[PDB]
Subunit: 319 residues, 2 copies
Amino acid sequence: SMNPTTCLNEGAIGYMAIDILQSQNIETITINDNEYKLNKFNNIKDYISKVWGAASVYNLDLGNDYTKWQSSLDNVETDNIKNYINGHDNVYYNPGGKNKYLIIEASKELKWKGNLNNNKFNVNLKSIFSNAENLKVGHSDLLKLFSSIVNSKGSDNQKKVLNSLLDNINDRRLKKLVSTGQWTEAISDSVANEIAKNNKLTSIKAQLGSQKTQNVMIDANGHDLLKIDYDKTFVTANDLKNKIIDKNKLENAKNYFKIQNNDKILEDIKSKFSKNINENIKGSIRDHAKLIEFTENKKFNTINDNSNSDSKIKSITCK
Amino acid sequence: SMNPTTCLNEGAIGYMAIDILQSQNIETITINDNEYKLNKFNNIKDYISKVWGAASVYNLDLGNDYTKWQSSLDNVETDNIKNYINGHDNVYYNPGGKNKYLIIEASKELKWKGNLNNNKFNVNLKSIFSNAENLKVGHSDLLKLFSSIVNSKGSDNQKKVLNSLLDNINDRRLKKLVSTGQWTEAISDSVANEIAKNNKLTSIKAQLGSQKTQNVMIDANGHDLLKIDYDKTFVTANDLKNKIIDKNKLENAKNYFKIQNNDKILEDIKSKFSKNINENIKGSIRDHAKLIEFTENKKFNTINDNSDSKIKSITCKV
């Protein structure tokens, strides 16, 4: 899943792994009974150009201090980093059943360097292989696989760098999960209810962006949601799909409610999230939850070396 | 989900709950957390006629000894009961070339009374409510709800009967999950591999009947599956469909391998299954897994008297 504020932490882990594999002349990896041949990379720049869509827009001078990769990108993009981490989409609430209202307006749209599309920020780990179009494994699990290779084969120093990269990813992915309001769906109901209680949050059914309705916990910010006339106060989703915008009602969607993301709720959620992940999830949010879980728990895959029988080509097996 | 060998145990639990609710003039149940109005039933025959698709085919004289309901159906259907519990579908295996082969032949097709279709055995617990269009709770969780009402509000005698019924359902649902070979999909991978090692099973990708390919553990009976000439030994799936059936090859699919369901593997699986359900199952197998889980653990829902008067209500704390 794409996230411009963690993408080069993820890219660094993939490079650390290929550096180790190439140092050891390991040319293929077995993943679930299938053999995948590694592309060979000449250096960081070669690798980045292959796996990261935004490579040529930024032309960063990345070096072998991996803990500085993301911060090199952060320095180019300045305010966008924090604004992304803290950003959320439009929040719609349907009080009666037949009309949805915009109750919280989306964060301001971000403009990245070169007007880059979000998808350019993806680190395509599958491109580390020369024939992985058949590889079913998701991005978090590939990140886990390459992490596991670094944990297994890396020096004590590399293992320390890996743990810093993983923590970096965890911090910002979790803060984004909280800031968007997506955390409630990803965590189990009873644990979410307790966090809501402890943080004076209000549970509603709502739409985040164009997603289907989900449990969302908002800070009602001193309002009794039973007592608001939404039709007088906020625009309908229907109105928005044309130019039927009441300027005052759009203004109200900046002022009434909040998605809470302060350090208290962050600490509350971090304390409970990994060990209380809700089972049924899909798409981006599932990759999100899995990334957070993995980067927190750091339970690595076992990496087996295959016996070089004919003293020929070296390979390893994962899972 | 349907199962002719447990259906009237499930049906009995629903009736025990509604008998308790009507005795106490309780008219609605809050669930997640909408309120659902109960239908009222005059007697067992009224109830069974509403919830059980097969009621009018069997016309059983069910009484208020609930531990005799399923056994009265078992007596009508005789051999079909054990043959269903122990039964499995065709098992197809593709050794890696262009064709899949029938490696284990299905258990003989069963003919129930009136040649009933399987779906007619369903106990539709949602029919206990007059308004359950908006109820998204599934069968196992409804059975768990009605069981919880019996445990919470029932007499000691009714609780004892409930416990017998839950155990009957657990025995037969679990033995069916094992006998079909479905258990592997339903349980976590590391635990399935443990069980396979303990029972000398072989892990293959296979298809059970017409379902999509899944992980199946077979007892290879000491045969080396790498050394078999499948095309000389077994019927292809396409030939089977087209009824081009070499009788010796079909006979091989009765004799080579089996789906292990002996008491050794049943006890092994029972000891580990409910604690280790695969988090990624859906539909019919998920209902099977949940039914087994609940009838094993018996951790009932909290049932609150919401009350208040004049309309008496209860709330399933869930």
